[PDB]
Amino acid sequence: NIQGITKPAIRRLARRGGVKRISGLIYEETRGVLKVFLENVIRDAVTYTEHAKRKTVTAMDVVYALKRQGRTLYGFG
Amino acid sequence: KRHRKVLRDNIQGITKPAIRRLARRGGVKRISGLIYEETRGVLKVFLENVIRDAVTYTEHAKRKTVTAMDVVYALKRQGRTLYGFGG
Amino acid sequence: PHRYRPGTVALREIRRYQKSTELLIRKLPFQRLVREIAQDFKTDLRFQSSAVMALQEACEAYLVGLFEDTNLCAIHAKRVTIMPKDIQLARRIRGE
Amino acid sequence: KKPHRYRPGTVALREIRRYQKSTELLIRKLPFQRLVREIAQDFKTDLRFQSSAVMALQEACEAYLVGLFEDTNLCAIHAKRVTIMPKDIQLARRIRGER
Amino acid sequence: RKESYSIYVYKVLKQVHPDTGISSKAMGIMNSFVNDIFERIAGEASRLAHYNKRSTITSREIQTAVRLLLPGELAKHAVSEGTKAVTKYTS
Amino acid sequence: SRKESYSIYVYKVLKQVHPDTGISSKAMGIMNSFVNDIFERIAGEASRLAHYNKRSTITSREIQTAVRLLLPGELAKHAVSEGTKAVTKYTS
Amino acid sequence: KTRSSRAGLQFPVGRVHRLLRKGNYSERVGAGAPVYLAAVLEYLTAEILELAGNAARDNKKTRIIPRHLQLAIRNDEELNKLLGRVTIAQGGVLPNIQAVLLPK
Amino acid sequence: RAKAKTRSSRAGLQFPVGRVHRLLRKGNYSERVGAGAPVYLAAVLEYLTAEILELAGNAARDNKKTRIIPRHLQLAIRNDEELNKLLGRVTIAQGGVLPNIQAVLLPK
Amino acid sequence: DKPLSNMKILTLGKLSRNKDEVKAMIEKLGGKLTGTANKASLCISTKKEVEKMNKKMEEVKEANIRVVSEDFLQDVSASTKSLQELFLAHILSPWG
DNA sequence: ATCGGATGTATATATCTGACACGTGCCTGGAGACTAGGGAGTAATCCCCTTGGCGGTTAAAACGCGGGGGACAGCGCGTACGTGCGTTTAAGCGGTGCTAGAGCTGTCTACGACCAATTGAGCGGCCTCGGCACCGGGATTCTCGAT
DNA sequence: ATCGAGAATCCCGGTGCCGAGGCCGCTCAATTGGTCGTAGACAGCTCTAGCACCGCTTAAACGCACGTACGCGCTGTCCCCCGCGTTTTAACCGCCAAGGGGATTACTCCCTAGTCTCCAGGCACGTGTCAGATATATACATCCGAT
């Protein structure tokens, strides 16, 4: 399933990141890193959801998760 | 009313071989000489930020003397929590 | 027939995607991934649509900044080409 | 007979083992205290110190510098350099978010 | 019902740039900024209170929290503004 | 004048894990530093949880949740198990 | 009357006070604390909106949008220092290429 | 009245559940504090303490020292993934660092 | 200062600052750059181009548009002096 | 190097639509006008711990002199990654429809706070002794320049 | 290539000390055990937002070809760094003297919390337009050979 993160999407991300030239080995590594980054956030988010006795995750769960994980996102508070 | 001699340029007292010993504990094998002054600058800035906030806690306490707790608070808010001097 | 040189369109692409703000990953499969990840922390979960969007913004942002570090790692290595070791170095320096 | 000499960098490895084994502080005590006092005297006059406060600063500063040099080491190694250069520090601090 | 800073932010916008509007997403981000900074200041003010056994957060805590949090010219200007506002409120 | 610390409880725990073993005062100061920090982390997140859920009360639920956020997995699970066991025992 | 009107501020001093009390930060909150805090928030608001408005004018747009905020925040050193670990929805990044990557 | 008995003793804990409750109230974290909280908290702290001191005592034993010192704590902390992750932004006075050299730096 | 106003200032002839530096100076100065003399206000160059007299500058001379040495940019990026007088101070157009 | 092919980009004009800029109804949370209990401000007093300085020792830093190996400019050459065309595919969209569960309202009572009597627990001070440090000498390791 | 100096390191053993471990008074902070009000657990209802599924379009991702320029293994040579010996020099240590200010206690009162009554700032939610998205044709900017 994770392979749905497309090669040209990763390229566009690298381009917003100012990268000129790209080893193919990047794509799988990036998918691995992304998966870990997602997992850590999601675990805490689900933890807020579960603490709240919800079955539904909120954007606030993501906010609190990201804030405690040191990456405070404005635009969803 | 009996003060010590006024302080200037003490950043040079951070010795080359001390900087080397620090780099050695940091596992550095080989050192370019340009490192010494750059390190001094980085250290000077690093110190200044902590010290200012420590003094800020000292001022809020209306104290004239800086405590280790003042240092601890400064470091903790600056994200570099030090165990060894709390209380 | 006409051509650009290698890298020229890549510099054009940098200008494009740095001038723009649009999210870069496909919405649907990003959500699909999030759901299967979440299933391992708890079964039978559901999501606010906004949470998906917020996650995508966060992830793309995290990746972009990390790629700038990666770019700088390659540049410090005299490469113009990124390699996995650049990411590993950046992540290690970040303390991940 | 030619006097003994270790090969270049052999003693530096011995020095790495040495200072990685010990816990001891590495900067000259009173000069460090003078620097701290000097810096503090730029923010407010006649500031006084607990002895402990000074020791804690030296601990903090040495630890910060050491970890920073470890990152610096990696930066040179990644650059295939055996030798550290100011750019290594700068790069690391930039990645760290100090810049 | 649901609170926000938004109308106050809107009046600030009208003050600095009468002819200029704002997007809903941007106004959301403004609320995020306000919330964040309020929490930062208040948390440090609480810590100052604990560190000095004080029951009361006061102007002096806020002034100090600002001095810890803000970079130089923002801190100075914010201090001036808070001092002024307190002076006017007192009179 | 009167101070307080965790030090005796740390020392009892020390006797329990390693009967024959002592500790330095500076190391004990570090242990106190550790207890303080981890206490404060937990209590802050408990407060946030309670706040986000409008609860006036911090409870066992908050501590359990706070731990499940703060700690790495197996360390957290052992901690969750311990705290749960202590609560059921205490309740009896 | 209103507390904000005596302060000469747009921010809601009463709401600030009530927030401070129920935000559990202390047993007590002296009367000037919310006034000072409101002024700080309002000032920072003004400083942001000023620069974002300038950015929007440069972009030839009458309305402030997330791009403009991010742009302003990363162009000012003190804002960027204050907000470094923050991320902004639909902000993107500063247009930026390292000179080594260019032609010749 | 009945003979005085500690909440800590009922919990089967060394850590001071009563002092913990006091600190929770005075720490302003919430308007109210349910009695299971100080128990659960104490147990957690006491467990983490034991988990540290086990490995620190091992580090000391390995060093042929019978008394724990700051070096042991730091060593034990960096030698566990979970403690190191828990304490990664934490510095330890007189801890030193892991003895560690990158292979590229060694002789041929 | 912002002494210019969208002035589409043309840039030619082996400028020692890069085109994006010159653009940044012009546009900090309230201007805009151009490649087109037909819609330019003014042009800036090394004196060598008024020695070379390439078709590009010759079009500017035939537009009679005033032209100045590159240190004009340095001067406007440093001083509030009347551009009319700075033409003289940096003059490469005897024309206009 | 210039010079023109190209194609990509930014700039006028229309337009259209829908988001935000603004108005009205209205309610709750701020706020005006009380009260008082105690937080904290201010004074006074103690003494301790911080600050300064002097003399003596010797560890460390500074300083100078090789020299070798690491830094890095050049470069030959192999591929892997950028650009581009043609293929295919699945993301997207606007639709529909469903019902789970999130959210609001409402009851009732479990239990955390508040006070008050009691006492033993943990802290502060004063013992006393063994784990550790400390040479100091002795055994082992590891390095280098021979071969 | 493997083999001797010889330099550094780590290992036993007598001293001795001083920090850690320990024990006793004993103050206040925990517990004991009573209220009681309201937090919040639990039931109920509803409507909304999330979930599911459907057909069509076309933007996107993909898959293949190819060449160039990038990465990168190799070489020379230059010096800047490491290592080692002499110098000096200032850090370090003891012990001494002064006195600033941290710390604590006691008093007094200013003021922040709390309460009730009042009501307009601020919130919800209608609605009109002009901000700006979307072409689209157009006139610029700029890249790339081919000269």
Side-chain angles (χ1 to χ4, degrees):
Chain A
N1 282 329
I2 176 60
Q3 289 299 320
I5 301 296
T6 75
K7 173 179 172 184
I10 301 156
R11 297 178 73 83
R12 288 187 298 274
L13 284 156
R15 290 290 186 264
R16 187 171 280 157
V19 171
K20 189 170 178 185
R21 199 170 178 268
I22 310 177
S23 174
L25 304 177
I26 297 298
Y27 305 128
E28 298 293 69
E29 184 74 342
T30 303
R31 287 172 186 127
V33 175
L34 169 59
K35 188 176 187 285
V36 167
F37 183 83
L38 284 165
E39 277 169 6
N40 292 326
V41 173
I42 287 165
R43 179 176 59 251
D44 285 6
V46 174
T47 306
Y48 290 112
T49 311
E50 178 165 55
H51 180 76
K53 302 194 66 177
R54 279 181 279 103
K55 284 191 165 192
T56 300
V57 178
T58 67
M60 297 309 308
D61 303 334
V62 185
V63 166
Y64 303 147
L66 289 176
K67 182 152 64 179
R68 80 167 296 280
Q69 298 190 10
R71 300 192 68 75
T72 296
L73 170 59
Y74 295 179
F76 298 97
Chain B
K1 307 300 180 185
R2 227 181 287 274
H3 53 88
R4 64 179 174 273
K5 187 172 63 78
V6 68
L7 296 166
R8 299 177 294 108
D9 196 29
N10 281 276
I11 186 60
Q12 293 300 314
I14 307 302
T15 75
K16 167 170 183 179
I19 296 157
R20 182 158 63 224
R21 284 188 295 276
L22 288 153
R24 289 290 189 259
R25 187 172 281 157
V28 175
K29 188 180 182 182
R30 202 170 178 268
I31 298 151
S32 190
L34 301 185
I35 293 292
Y36 304 125
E37 285 300 309
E38 183 75 327
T39 304
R40 280 171 181 139
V42 170
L43 173 61
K44 181 177 184 297
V45 171
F46 179 78
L47 283 164
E48 275 170 17
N49 284 323
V50 181
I51 288 169
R52 197 190 312 104
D53 288 356
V55 172
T56 310
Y57 289 112
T58 316
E59 289 167 341
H60 194 70
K62 297 189 168 186
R63 278 190 277 98
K64 306 187 181 186
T65 306
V66 191
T67 79
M69 295 310 303
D70 313 2
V71 178
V72 164
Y73 299 152
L75 287 173
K76 179 176 175 183
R77 76 165 301 286
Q78 296 180 20
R80 297 194 177 283
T81 297
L82 168 58
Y83 293 175
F85 305 88
Chain C
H2 174 67
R3 224 176 211 277
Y4 298 109
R5 294 185 74 185
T8 300
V9 189
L11 293 163
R12 203 158 70 215
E13 288 175 348
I14 294 170
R15 289 191 180 90
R16 182 173 181 141
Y17 297 107
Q18 288 187 345
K19 184 168 181 279
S20 81
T21 64
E22 292 181 292
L23 290 177
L24 301 180
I25 305 161
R26 299 297 106 248
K27 300 297 196 73
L28 175 64
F30 180 81
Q31 178 175 285
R32 192 182 294 134
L33 170 67
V34 167
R35 292 184 191 279
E36 186 166 354
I37 288 178
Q39 182 69 358
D40 286 354
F41 299 113
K42 198 175 179 73
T43 54
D44 196 36
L45 292 173
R46 306 195 323 157
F47 301 76
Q48 287 191 332
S49 178
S50 54
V52 188
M53 301 300 90
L55 284 163
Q56 192 169 336
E57 292 273 336
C59 295
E60 292 192 13
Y62 165 74
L63 291 173
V64 167
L66 175 58
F67 280 136
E68 291 195 302
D69 308 328
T70 309
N71 205 18
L72 293 164
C73 296
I75 288 161
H76 190 72
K78 299 194 171 188
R79 285 181 284 107
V80 299
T81 311
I82 59 160
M83 300 179 171
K85 53 177 180 185
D86 298 322
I87 299 170
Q88 291 152 15
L89 180 63
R91 291 189 72 243
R92 184 170 180 182
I93 290 170
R94 288 160 155 247
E96 303 190 22
Chain D
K1 296 182 190 291
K2 190 169 63 190
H4 181 281
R5 167 173 278 256
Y6 289 100
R7 283 185 81 187
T10 298
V11 191
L13 289 165
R14 194 160 72 225
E15 287 170 4
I16 291 161
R17 291 198 183 91
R18 172 170 175 167
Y19 298 107
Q20 288 191 340
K21 187 177 291 192
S22 70
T23 62
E24 299 186 337
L25 292 177
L26 303 181
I27 304 175
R28 302 267 51 83
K29 298 294 216 303
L30 178 68
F32 176 88
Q33 184 189 136
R34 290 195 303 252
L35 174 59
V36 165
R37 286 184 186 278
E38 193 177 319
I39 289 167
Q41 288 170 215
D42 305 327
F43 295 122
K44 185 172 176 72
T45 51
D46 303 353
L47 292 176
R48 295 165 73 96
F49 288 84
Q50 296 184 325
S51 173
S52 55
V54 185
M55 290 297 294
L57 288 167
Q58 194 170 330
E59 284 282 347
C61 298
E62 290 198 22
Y64 167 78
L65 291 177
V66 169
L68 176 62
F69 282 137
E70 292 215 287
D71 299 328
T72 309
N73 207 6
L74 301 178
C75 299
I77 289 162
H78 193 73
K80 301 192 174 183
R81 280 184 287 105
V82 182
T83 315
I84 58 161
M85 296 180 174
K87 45 180 170 188
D88 298 308
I89 305 176
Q90 292 157 16
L91 175 72
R93 292 191 341 98
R94 191 177 174 181
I95 297 164
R96 285 162 151 240
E98 301 178 27
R99 289 297 182 276
Chain E
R1 209 56 62 182
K2 301 304 301 186
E3 301 192 287
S4 77
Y5 304 101
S6 308
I7 73 183
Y8 323 111
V9 176
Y10 210 94
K11 292 190 180 184
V12 179
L13 174 56
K14 292 306 92 180
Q15 286 170 328
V16 301
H17 290 297
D19 305 335
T20 299
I22 185 164
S23 59
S24 175
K25 289 189 168 70
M27 178 61 85
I29 288 155
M30 299 312 299
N31 283 267
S32 314
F33 173 83
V34 176
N35 277 286
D36 185 2
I37 296 301
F38 189 125
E39 288 170 18
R40 291 185 202 190
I41 293 171
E44 194 53 40
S46 184
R47 287 184 294 267
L48 290 170
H50 290 175
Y51 298 171
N52 298 277
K53 314 170 187 174
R54 285 291 194 272
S55 92
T56 315
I57 286 167
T58 81
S59 54
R60 198 166 177 276
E61 283 61 38
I62 301 304
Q63 174 154 305
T64 302
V66 165
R67 285 174 173 273
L68 293 171
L69 287 160
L70 277 63
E73 308 307 299
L74 305 188
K76 291 170 184 169
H77 295 184
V79 160
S80 177
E81 290 295 289
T83 304
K84 286 164 57 181
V86 166
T87 306
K88 201 190 193 295
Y89 180 84
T90 303
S91 63
Chain F
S1 56
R2 185 177 180 286
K3 310 307 302 187
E4 296 200 319
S5 79
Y6 311 102
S7 309
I8 69 184
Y9 321 110
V10 180
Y11 206 81
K12 290 194 182 186
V13 172
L14 177 58
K15 295 299 91 181
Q16 283 181 284
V17 300
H18 286 291
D20 308 326
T21 295
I23 185 158
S24 83
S25 49
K26 288 191 173 75
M28 181 60 83
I30 289 158
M31 296 310 300
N32 280 275
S33 309
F34 168 79
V35 174
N36 279 299
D37 176 10
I38 297 309
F39 183 120
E40 291 154 25
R41 290 185 205 188
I42 291 171
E45 194 60 21
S47 182
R48 291 172 206 126
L49 289 167
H51 179 65
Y52 300 160
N53 296 271
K54 305 182 185 289
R55 290 295 188 274
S56 85
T57 319
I58 284 168
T59 84
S60 57
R61 188 175 179 74
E62 286 58 46
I63 309 311
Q64 177 157 291
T65 307
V67 168
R68 282 181 174 168
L69 291 164
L70 284 159
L71 278 65
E74 301 309 303
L75 189 76
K77 286 165 192 175
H78 293 309
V80 164
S81 186
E82 288 271 29
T84 304
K85 183 175 70 177
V87 164
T88 57
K89 193 189 191 300
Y90 175 79
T91 300
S92 78
Chain G
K1 201 53 172 287
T2 83
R3 297 163 72 181
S4 298
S5 69
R6 287 195 288 263
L9 294 176
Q10 303 313 289
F11 269 58
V13 170
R15 186 178 296 175
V16 176
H17 184 194
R18 180 254 296 172
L19 279 170
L20 288 172
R21 295 198 311 275
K22 289 192 171 184
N24 327 101
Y25 299 108
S26 58
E27 284 289 3
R28 297 195 178 231
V29 181
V35 172
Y36 208 119
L37 172 57
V40 173
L41 294 163
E42 186 165 315
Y43 164 63
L44 291 171
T45 310
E47 197 75 5
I48 287 168
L49 288 177
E50 163 62 33
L51 297 175
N54 303 338
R57 176 173 289 164
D58 306 329
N59 193 232
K60 301 183 182 175
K61 293 290 171 66
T62 70
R63 304 188 298 219
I64 293 165
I65 85 112
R67 184 50 165 180
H68 309 146
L69 290 171
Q70 169 69 323
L71 286 174
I73 287 164
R74 307 308 169 176
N75 273 278
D76 183 81
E77 177 168 9
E78 286 192 312
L79 297 186
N80 204 5
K81 176 59 179 184
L82 185 65
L83 302 174
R85 307 194 77 190
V86 179
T87 296
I88 301 177
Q90 288 301 301
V93 298
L94 290 178
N96 183 359
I97 302 184
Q98 310 319 303
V100 175
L101 306 181
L102 302 181
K104 303 299 191 177
Chain H
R1 302 197 305 214
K3 190 177 180 182
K5 185 67 168 288
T6 69
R7 292 187 283 169
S8 316
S9 69
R10 289 184 181 98
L13 295 181
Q14 303 314 312
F15 271 49
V17 179
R19 187 177 288 181
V20 170
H21 179 201
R22 186 192 90 209
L23 289 165
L24 287 173
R25 296 201 307 278
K26 289 193 174 184
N28 307 292
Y29 301 112
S30 63
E31 279 278 76
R32 297 190 90 76
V33 188
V39 172
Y40 203 124
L41 175 55
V44 167
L45 295 163
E46 184 168 329
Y47 162 66
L48 299 170
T49 307
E51 194 70 87
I52 289 163
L53 289 184
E54 162 58 24
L55 295 172
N58 298 339
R61 193 188 300 182
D62 301 335
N63 211 349
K64 305 185 180 284
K65 301 301 171 72
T66 70
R67 201 190 304 150
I68 293 169
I69 75 130
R71 183 51 162 178
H72 306 151
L73 300 178
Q74 174 80 309
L75 284 168
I77 287 162
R78 306 311 160 182
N79 293 331
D80 171 30
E81 180 174 30
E82 295 195 304
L83 286 171
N84 187 46
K85 177 57 179 180
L86 185 66
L87 305 169
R89 304 193 77 203
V90 188
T91 292
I92 310 302
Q94 285 304 291
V97 299
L98 293 181
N100 182 14
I101 309 188
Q102 310 320 317
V104 64
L105 305 177
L106 298 180
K108 307 305 186 185
Chain I
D1 193 20
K2 290 163 179 173
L4 316 176
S5 62
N6 196 34
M7 278 162 70
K8 285 167 185 169
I9 290 188
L10 177 61
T11 54
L12 288 176
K14 205 71 169 183
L15 286 153
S16 63
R17 299 204 75 167
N18 296 275
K19 181 177 63 177
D20 58 318
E21 303 177 68
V22 176
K23 190 172 174 185
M25 296 171 86
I26 286 166
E27 297 187 7
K28 283 171 179 184
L29 296 164
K32 194 163 188 168
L33 180 142
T34 193
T36 290
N38 307 72
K39 306 198 297 188
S41 181
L42 291 171
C43 189
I44 310 190
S45 194
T46 66
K47 175 161 164 61
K48 298 173 183 177
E49 182 45 45
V50 181
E51 312 320 307
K52 285 176 171 186
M53 310 201 80
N54 191 17
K55 46 166 57 165
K56 308 181 80 179
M57 81 66 50
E58 300 271 36
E59 294 142 27
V60 185
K61 178 178 178 184
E62 290 303 337
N64 292 281
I65 284 165
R66 284 180 287 274
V67 183
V68 287
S69 53
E70 182 167 25
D71 70 332
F72 183 103
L73 287 149
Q74 191 66 9
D75 194 356
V76 287
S77 189
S79 87
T80 61
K81 286 186 178 185
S82 300
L83 305 185
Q84 298 89 340
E85 201 281 323
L86 297 194
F87 305 153
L88 324 176
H90 301 287
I91 201 70
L92 299 182
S93 58
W95 61 86

